[PDB]
Amino acid sequence: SLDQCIVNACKNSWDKSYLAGTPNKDNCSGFVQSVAAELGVPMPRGNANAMVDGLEQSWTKLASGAEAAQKAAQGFLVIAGLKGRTYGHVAVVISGPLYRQKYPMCWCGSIAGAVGQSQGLKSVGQVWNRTDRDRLNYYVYSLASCSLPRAS
């Protein structure tokens, strides 16, 4: 794919509650935490702003959304993130055609409701406001999370 393991982790994480009592579909940071936990990727703790701060300090940053999609297609966990004045947002980037040839497809939950939610059917350029989508950071983990295709 080779992002099938990541897509699977997204699907599995959608109905989980990383923070007890708070469905991940209603909590962007919790959703990403559950995905990372399933994949065995260490993550900074906390809300979206805190996670972005941690990723900024420790993870390789990609140059573009196009590169983000390519890395996800190679089996890497790639997080799109941007800090907010009051609330930030984070999302998992997956492989797929770029929206407006620029913005990669994603999975994310959000307390905002539908506008901040994507089950792989929206891009980061639809979830984030127009004044934010060109300001996103894309962080990739140092090792691929996905495995070889099935042997048989």
From Swiss-Prot:
**List of catalytic residues:** 28, 89
GO cellular component, alphabetical, reads:
extracellular region; host cell membrane; membrane
Q: Which residues form the signal peptide?
A: none
Among SUPFAM superfamilies, the record links this protein to:
Cysteine proteinases
Q: Which GO terms describe its molecular function?
A: amidase activity
Show the catalytic activity.
Hydrolysis of gamma-D-glutamyl bonds to the L-terminus (position 7) of meso-diaminopimelic acid (meso-A2pm) in 7-(L-Ala-gamma-D-Glu)-meso-A2pm and 7-(L-Ala-gamma-D-Glu)-7-(D-Ala)-meso-A2pm. It is required that the D-terminal amino and carboxy groups of meso-A2pm are unsubstituted
Which residues are connected by disulfide bridges in this protein?
5-146
Keyword vocabulary terms for this entry: Disulfide bond, Host membrane, Hydrolase, Membrane, Secreted
Q: Which top-rank group of organisms is this from?
A: Bacteria
Q: What is its main location?
A: host cell
Q: Under which EC number(s) is this enzyme classified? A: 3.4.19.11
- Location(s), subcellular: Host membrane; Secreted
InterPro entries this protein is in?
Papain-like_cys_pep_sf
How this chain assembles, per its entry, is: Forms a heterotetramer with Tsi1 consisting of two Tse1 dimers and two Tsi1 dimers. Formation of the complex inactivates Tse1 enzymatic activity.
Job description of the protein: Toxin secreted by the H1 type VI (H1-T6SS) secretion system into the periplasm of recipient cells. Degrades peptidoglycan via amidase activity thereby helping itself to compete with other bacteria. To protect itself, the bacterium synthesizes immunity protein Tsi1 that specifically interacts with and inactivates cognate toxin.
**Name this protein carries in UniProt:** Peptidoglycan amidase Tse1
